[PDB]
DNA sequence: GCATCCGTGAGTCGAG
């Protein structure tokens, strides 16, 4: 089976930040740069 | 249960010295260890999500 | 940025608002040109960000950049389970685990 | 002291990119006009994508073809990026045929031409075929809107066909710029600029127009008020 | 906390002024910051409190909407027959509590207006609301504080 | 929170008594097919479906609302059990 | 792939001329906030209304001065003047100057303003000032048609040397609050439900207010027509 | 009264 990413899957970085994807937003909802480039992931600062 | 597969990184006729990469293993990109994706992140709270 | 200036686009009004905010935050040195302050922010690793739902900028500059993230093997597709009724144990006559 | 209909400027490069300026506008209307269009442009603009693939001697997506370097997963990954323009407005579906062999690099050009169908990116790589390596494909491209995953549509022309994830939206990127302008003694007026990048399947301007039409048609939905029976 | 905190600025730096017009002129020249503490007529105040005076919350937040002043600026607003020196943000918080519990007087009593909201103050708020208005209205208050808390935490930067 | 829960906690000397009251009442309503309800048609709890509004199938909701209307009598040793059963059967067949 | 969409049903819930709720469901994904935000901006900023721009009071030099014989200071009266809701019956009329003269032990309400042609005072019971024995109030207020919110320091208009500029609140709309809730039609759970809430001063009704708002937006969509 | 010996305890769901 070919598994895409879905709500409930676990992501983590190498520095010990770990979390579950809680929301998949459509591209238009995503915070973007002035040139129109959207971001893939929104991390919470409170975790740092 | 993860799928372990190798993929060829070279092409017909290519000259290769000793130790050059031929096939890319699982979780490997051009001989470098690949455990995930490089994504563009923004660090801000978002609507309690 | 320099590309953007060459493309014939000056500073956005939203970028002005955000720059006022960052100026109040002591992030950028007051009196500089908008380009200078945007460079000052970008150097601190922060950029101006627009909320996609509104179009209005996030009041502050936000830290944005490429990060390496992995998908761990704990996957919801494996873990989700529910039962109404099902098999029962031999001696205890209780539901199996 | 009432602003009126602003000048509308249009800049274009190819069928790919475009800039659309509206000036002068009342304060804040740069965003009021600019952002909704962006949202509609990025999502609801109809387009084309490959909805299915059949290769001969290939039962499923997980298999490798002899003589072919790329695995079927990668071949379909490459097929995802194929840009297929329909000249006919009435044409809902097209099946592209590819037949190739011998040492060669099979590109998008190698598809057998169909009437009122044009490949906007002929240089797109598909496969690398070795000596004796033989590739035969039938791909199905459809008209659709938004992003419909292969799991959702499950479109198959035949038994061994492989359903493919389809991104229909021709719009690659949308940005909008609000700059300070003035008319007469008025100040702090908005000058709006919509920058649009597409795949060439449809031009930026077409997209902008049908997106506007979408916004208007949605504004239509307020025209028939109705009493709340909650009480 | 981000909406309920007030700005403290260093530009004005405690200058003395005879008449308010002098202060307004001074700020206009860029000599004195909006939120910087100063003494007009011998009693301490800020330029912001003099310059902008709102007849009601709706007007104030309307001004915040048009970019006249921010939620963190100290200003003067008329609320419930009282003349208040406070931020529009705090007026907003107060109106959130009030709308949530559907009692304006009680709400006005529960809140501590002149301090920025945090874990302890909000805890005390939840408890007092429990006691006075009961668990249903307290649950509604909770949901509200959740909503606005998140919504504002987002755009806070 | 359950609507008017504070009033319900006011009505009884112990919260668990409220619980028992509501549960028993709900069982009565289920058994008698809601015919025995003390609620007027306009006071009927409504579930909003695809077609339109309908009667709320949930017995507990009903019982709590009925209880809120003060149209119910709750207490110990009101009437002998079989008598209550037979009478409720008489007025409302099942 | 093949898509079906039903035209949403517009739901209206109104209490008097002061308020209304507006529910539009179902909507396609993301279109909740797509219509929602623009209408909010347009409603608050651009909807035509009337405000008190300038006020002159006899024997009063500036804004923070006090009026002998009256309890409220000048500032408190200016505030009360900000809440005055004035309606122009004639579309031709751009501006009015309302005069008021009173004295003695009387509490001046908005009724006391001398009537003007095609000018309706929506809130005649509104409190302006209270006067004691020996107190006198002579004032003229300048009411202009406009849009949104203009601070006093921004227009700076004076008919007289002693006339005081007032922050002008033109917007008949007091507040706009909108929220998008996930609702479902059949199989799909994400479909958008737009709930809109609008406050007004009574001069223009919320339904009228929203209809004006969607008109302004729609007209702007026609500005993409001719290059 | 005080050293010494023998038996009985030592977190929860999950997968295994
Ligand atoms: Mg003022
Ligand atoms: Mg208090």
UniProtKB/Swiss-Prot annotation, chain C:
UniProt subunit comment: The RNAP catalytic core consists of 2 alpha, 1 beta, 1 beta' and 1 omega subunit. When a sigma factor is associated with the core the holoenzyme is formed, which can initiate transcription.
Family classification: Belongs to the RNA polymerase beta chain family.
Species of the source: Thermus thermophilus (strain ATCC 27634 / DSM 579 / HB8)
Protein name per UniProt: DNA-directed RNA polymerase subunit beta
Role noted for this protein: DNA-dependent RNA polymerase catalyzes the transcription of DNA into RNA using the four ribonucleoside triphosphates as substrates.
Origin: domain of life: Bacteria
Swiss-Prot record, chain D:
GO biological process, one term: DNA-templated transcription
Function: DNA-dependent RNA polymerase catalyzes the transcription of DNA into RNA using the four ribonucleoside triphosphates as substrates.
Single GO molecular function: protein dimerization activity
Region (Alpha N-terminal domain (alpha-NTD)): 1-226
Keywords from the UniProt entry: DNA-directed RNA polymerase, Nucleotidyltransferase, Transcription, Transferase
Protein name as catalogued: DNA-directed RNA polymerase subunit alpha
Full protein: residues contained: 4 to 234 of 315
Quaternary context: Homodimer. The RNAP catalytic core consists of 2 alpha, 1 beta, 1 beta' and 1 omega subunit. When a sigma factor is associated with the core the holoenzyme is formed, which can initiate transcription.
Keyword flag Oxidoreductase: no
Record text about domains: The N-terminal domain is essential for RNAP assembly and basal transcription, whereas the C-terminal domain is involved in interaction with transcriptional regulators and with upstream promoter elements.
Catalytic activity, as annotated: RNA(n) + a ribonucleoside 5'-triphosphate = RNA(n+1) + diphosphate
Assigned EC number: 2.7.7.6
Domain of life: Bacteria
Family: Belongs to the RNA polymerase alpha chain family.
GO cellular component: cytoplasm; DNA-directed RNA polymerase complex
Name of the encoding gene: rpoA
Curated annotation (Swiss-Prot), chain E:
Family of this protein: Belongs to the RNA polymerase beta' chain family.
Assembly with partners or alone: The RNAP catalytic core consists of 2 alpha, 1 beta, 1 beta' and 1 omega subunit. When a sigma factor is associated with the core the holoenzyme is formed, which can initiate transcription.
Protein task: DNA-dependent RNA polymerase catalyzes the transcription of DNA into RNA using the four ribonucleoside triphosphates as substrates.
Protein name: DNA-directed RNA polymerase subunit beta'
Gene: rpoC
Residue window of the full protein shown: 790 to 946 of 1524
UniProtKB/Swiss-Prot annotation, chain F:
GO cellular component: DNA-directed RNA polymerase complex
Subunit structure: The RNAP catalytic core consists of 2 alpha, 1 beta, 1 beta' and 1 omega subunit. When a sigma factor is associated with the core the holoenzyme is formed, which can initiate transcription.
EC number in record: 2.7.7.6
Gene of this entry: rpoZ
A GO BP entry: DNA-templated transcription
Protein name in UniProt: DNA-directed RNA polymerase subunit omega
Classification via Gene3D superfamilies: 3.90.940.10
Biological role: Promotes RNA polymerase assembly. Latches the N- and C-terminal regions of the beta' subunit thereby facilitating its interaction with the beta and alpha subunits.
Transcription among keywords: yes
Keyword annotations: DNA-directed RNA polymerase, Nucleotidyltransferase, Transcription, Transferase
GO molecular function, a single term: DNA binding
Keyword Nucleotidyltransferase in annotation: yes
Catalyzed reaction equations: RNA(n) + a ribonucleoside 5'-triphosphate = RNA(n+1) + diphosphate
UniProt record similarity statement: Belongs to the RNA polymerase subunit omega family.
Coiled-coil zones: none
